[PDB]
Ligand binder design. Structure first.
Ligand SMILES: CCCCCCCCCCCCCCCCCC(=O)OC[C@H](COP(=O)([O-])OCC(O)COP(=O)([O-])OC[C@@H](COC(=O)CCCCCCCCCCCCCCCCC)OC(=O)CCCCCCCCCCCCCCCCC)OC(=O)CCCCCCCCCCCCCCCCC
Ligand SMILES: CCCCCCCCCCCCCCCCCC(=O)OC[C@H](COP(=O)([O-])OCC(O)COP(=O)([O-])OC[C@@H](COC(=O)CCCCCCCCCCCCCCCCC)OC(=O)CCCCCCCCCCCCCCCCC)OC(=O)CCCCCCCCCCCCCCCCC
Ligand SMILES: CCCCCCCCCCCCCCCCCC(=O)OC[C@H](COP(=O)([O-])OCC[N+](C)(C)C)OC(=O)CCCCCCCCCCCCCCCCC
Ligand SMILES: CCCCCCCCCCCCO[C@@H]1O[C@H](CO)[C@@H](O[C@H]2O[C@H](CO)[C@@H](O)[C@H](O)[C@H]2O)[C@H](O)[C@H]1O
Lengths: 71, 74, 52, 65, 110, 71, 71, 71, 71, 71, 71
């Protein structure tokens, strides 16, 4: 109940940007599907590839938050 | 400075799968150690399967970047 | 049915009975993918988790 | 959806106007499919020496062949 | 024994909440006698398939003990999944309430 | 003295980015449905995927706020 | 203890982002109704679906603010 | 009190996210009306419905700021 | 050992700032594949190059977080 | 001198806007390569010019950071 | 004595906006070039003109920070 909590809370500010990126990703997938449905599995594929970065980064931030909450 | 940049990129692309296999593994291990009931376990099985797929994705990404970084013309 | 002026339903049933008389011979069906694999995976995880 | 599928806008428009004409009421639909029947006879050449000749009475087979 | 995979799939469908709404809709204009007779008929169909097909057919699990081993394995699976789990819970309960072995303690000496 | 509350309230603030992402996602859904009304189940499915990711992150940040509050 | 006010106010900061998301969603609705005024119903449906989650987030933010205030 | 004033200002910071949402919604209304004047009234009703959500959140934030100010 | 933790938590903001940008890149990839499915390759190469750049920036910020966290 | 570590973190936060910029740039590049593919040789060139600037800026944001971490 | 470093970092925490602006410039350049290649020389001429201001702003954003590091 000191500075470790404050740091682990400030670490969580990146999740907003990560969520905005995920929203952009899946909004683009939605638009591409509405335009040309016949390549759904492709757009979805690339979307998952993008998540393979974005998710990873967010999880990193969460871990570092816990690391600063129990350093 | 370019050598330092390149080695940083290379090592990150090399350890990405190790991270996905080890640290997320430790997190899953914590959850396994803490959970007891059956409903939560049923729901957590799917998280484990997701981690499997995610690991294979990270491995594909690393393969791509490593064939890019270890390709020489001559 | 066309050779004896009977109904195709009756001829189908007769053929099925005569094939069931010799059921050692396998019959050819339309291939269908497996079903409920995700739920089955969850239940089998639950199984091993409680059983081992 | 058509430049990706290798299809022309005229083909798409015709093949969709056909379905629209199929969704008509019988008194007008009779006159519509009347005024929009098809009869053609394509004849393909290559420095003389006809390669083939073929008739067409349907839009889909006309665009396909 | 047969169709274990289908039985797992049936359990998965049963635990799915969408199937609960589907069953709610299917229960319209339906009787308990009809439901019970349907279930009994299903079980009879399974056991009758066994009784008939064992005469001429052999499964991948066929062994010199036949279906006895499959039924034993079903029993052992049930035991280890349900009964040993209950035993674990009862063990922790007794250990928190009396101590380990508290249910087998001797009466207080007079 | 009340530092746990500060840490919780600072960790909570990713709900803004989460909601921005959700709004962008459902806006893409609504637009793609206004364009292609015959394709709604696939769009709804991808929207549900994105919403699952975003709600997972949101419940993560809320859980961490509760943790820092009642450590 | 006036300090516990601060935490609550900070949690309330997220409401701005929430409102932004709501705005974007309703803008996408008000555009879609113009792009395809035949339907006007399944878009309000998806609007309500998204606003459910966003209102839930706002409600839990308000509740956590009041909680960290009074406690 | 100084804590009360800081808490009120922090709550005031939330205001402006609502402004972005309101602006996006109104801009969408203006564009939709211009593109399709035929549906001008429907757009107004839709915007009014959105207005209730944004107004409720904005007033709620100001109410919380005042409450924190006067404890 | 509190200022180091706070410094690292403050340095972790670029992760969220980079996730935006990765989202836009992969959204552009999706839209380009929806507009020209005949070109899947020659879009993923540029996507991976820009993603590599932003991944390098992520490496920078995470490296500096760990640096100040242990030095 | 923990404030050194803070100054460095603050000097690195700008990367969040940098990477965003880069993302937008490459997004436009991909869109161009999806619209007029036969002139990649132009678009990539212009993109490289932009990166030649943005890279430099990022390098400054690193360098000054390290300077404030040591001096 | 780290307050000078802190002020220099704060004054250096605005290059992200310059970078976003430059990214938008070159994104629009690439887009309008793929839309019309024959007019590149003017699109480039104005892009450079914009840089003639943006880079100058960034130069100030560095210079004043350096000054604040010592004075
Ligand atoms: C008293 C205290 C306790 C109270 C609380 C009790 C707890 C209750 C919890 C609720 C869950 C109960 C257990 C059932 C779980 C679901 C199992 C299942 O069937 O999935 C198999 C399902 C089917 O796979 P399959 O059997 O191989 O193939 C069959 C086909 O899919 C064909 O399948 P289908 O045709 O039958 O259905 C397909 C459906 C499959 O989707 C699903 O998997 C079903 C999930 C729905 C869960 C809803 C829970 C409702 C109760 C909670 C209230 C929530 C409020 C919202 C209410 C609904 C309104 C939206 O959809 C799709 O596949 C995609 C298309 C979308 C179609 C639209 C579906 C939505 C229909 C509208 C809703 C209907 C409401 C029913 C009314 C319920 C009345 C009680 O696949 C999955 O496994 C899905 C993934 C598993 C879900 C979890 C994902 C990972 C996240 C885990 C959680 C995080 C870890 C835990 C920590 C969290 C801390 C908070
Ligand atoms: C862990 C084992 C010990 C269990 C816990 C301790 C309990 C001890 C008591 C044992 C009592 C056993 C109960 C006997 C009752 C009769 C059951 C029966 O015969 O039918 C079983 C049942 C087959 O029912 P069926 O009516 O004969 O239908 C056949 C189909 O038409 C398909 O037609 P098909 O011709 O294509 O294939 C026929 C059959 C052919 O089966 C075979 O002939 C055996 C396969 C290769 C020969 C060597 C077998 C032993 C070593 C390799 C297999 C390791 C797994 C051990 C499996 C035990 C059964 C041999 O295929 C299978 O059934 C697949 C079985 C192998 C599953 C492999 C899953 C890999 C994940 C596990 C990680 C790897 C192992 C970790 C180390 C574990 C060491 C203990 O098999 C299933 O479990 C259905 C799977 C459905 C997919 C579910 C989603 C995937 C989850 C996979 C796990 C499945 C649950 C079992 C857990 C085992 C892995 C942990
Ligand atoms: C230009 C060059 C590019 C190089 C790219 C490099 C990137 C890929 C690097 C990943 C390496 C990871 C593999 C080692 C980790 C697993 C260790 C292990 O085997 O445990 C013992 C395993 C598990 O055994 P077990 O779990 O049943 O019990 C024993 C386990 N131990 C001993 C550990 C306690 O032994 C096996 O029985 C394996 C049999 C199944 C086959 C397993 C291989 C599949 C899973 C890994 C695939 C990874 C490659 C993916 C390639 C994708 C590219 C497109
Ligand atoms: C070579 C570097 C890159 C390769 C990555 C390999 C690292 C993988 C190791 C697991 C990572 C997390 O590991 C987890 O955090 C630290 C690691 O010491 C441990 O935590 C423990 O040590 C730390 C010391 O810093 C204490 O503050 C903490 O109270 C204690 O619980 C956990 O017990 C461990 O579960």
């Amino acid at each position: 109940a000191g500075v470790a909590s404050l740091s682990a809370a400030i670490a969580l500010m990146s999740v907003g940007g990560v969520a905005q990126g995920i929203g952009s990703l899946f909004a683009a997938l939605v638009s591409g599907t509405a335009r040309n449905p016949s390549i759904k599995e492709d757009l979805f594929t690339y979307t998952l590839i993008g998540m393979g970065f974005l998710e990873f980064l967010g999880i990193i931030c969460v871990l570092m938050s816990a690391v600063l909450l129990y350093s | 400075r370019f050598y330092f940049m390149y080695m940083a990129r290379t090592t990150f692309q090399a350890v990405r799968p190790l991270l996905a296999f080890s640290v997320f593994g430790e997190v899953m291990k914590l959850v396994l150690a803490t959970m007891s009931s059956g409903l939560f376990s049923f729901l957590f099985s799917f998280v484990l399967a997701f981690e499997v797929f995610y690991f294979f994705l990270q491995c594909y990404i690393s393969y791509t970047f490593l064939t890019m970084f270890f390709t020489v013309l001559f | 049915a066309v050779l004896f002026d009977l109904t195709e339903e009756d001829c189908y049933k007769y053929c099925i009975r005569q094939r069931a008389a010799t059921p050692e011979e396998l019959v050819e069906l339309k291939y269908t993918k497996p079903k409920n694999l995700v739920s089955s995976y969850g239940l089998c995880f639950l199984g091993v988790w409680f059983g081992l | 959806m058509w430049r990706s599928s290798g299809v022309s806008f005229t083909r798409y428009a015709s093949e969709m106007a056909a379905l629209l004409r199929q969704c008509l009421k019988e008194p007008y639909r009779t006159q519509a499919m009347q005024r929009n029947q098809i009869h053609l006879k394509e004849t393909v050449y290559q420095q003389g020496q006809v390669l083939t000749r073929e008739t067409f009475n349907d839009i889909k087979k006309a665009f396909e062949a | 024994g047969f169709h274990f995979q289908q039985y797992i799939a049936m359990a998965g469908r049963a635990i799915n909440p969408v199937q609960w709404t589907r069953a709610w809709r299917r229960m319209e204009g339906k009787s308990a006698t009809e439901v019970y007779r349907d279930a009994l008929a299903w079980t009879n169909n399974q056991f009758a398939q066994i009784s008939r097909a064992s005469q001429y057919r052999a499964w991948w699990w066929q062994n010199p003990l036949g279906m006895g081993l499959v039924l034993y394995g079903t029993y052992k699976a049930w035991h280890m999944i349900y009964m040993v789990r209950k035993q674990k819970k009862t063990a922790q309960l007794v250990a928190a309430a009396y101590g380990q072995g508290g249910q087998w303690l001797n009466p207080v000496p007079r």
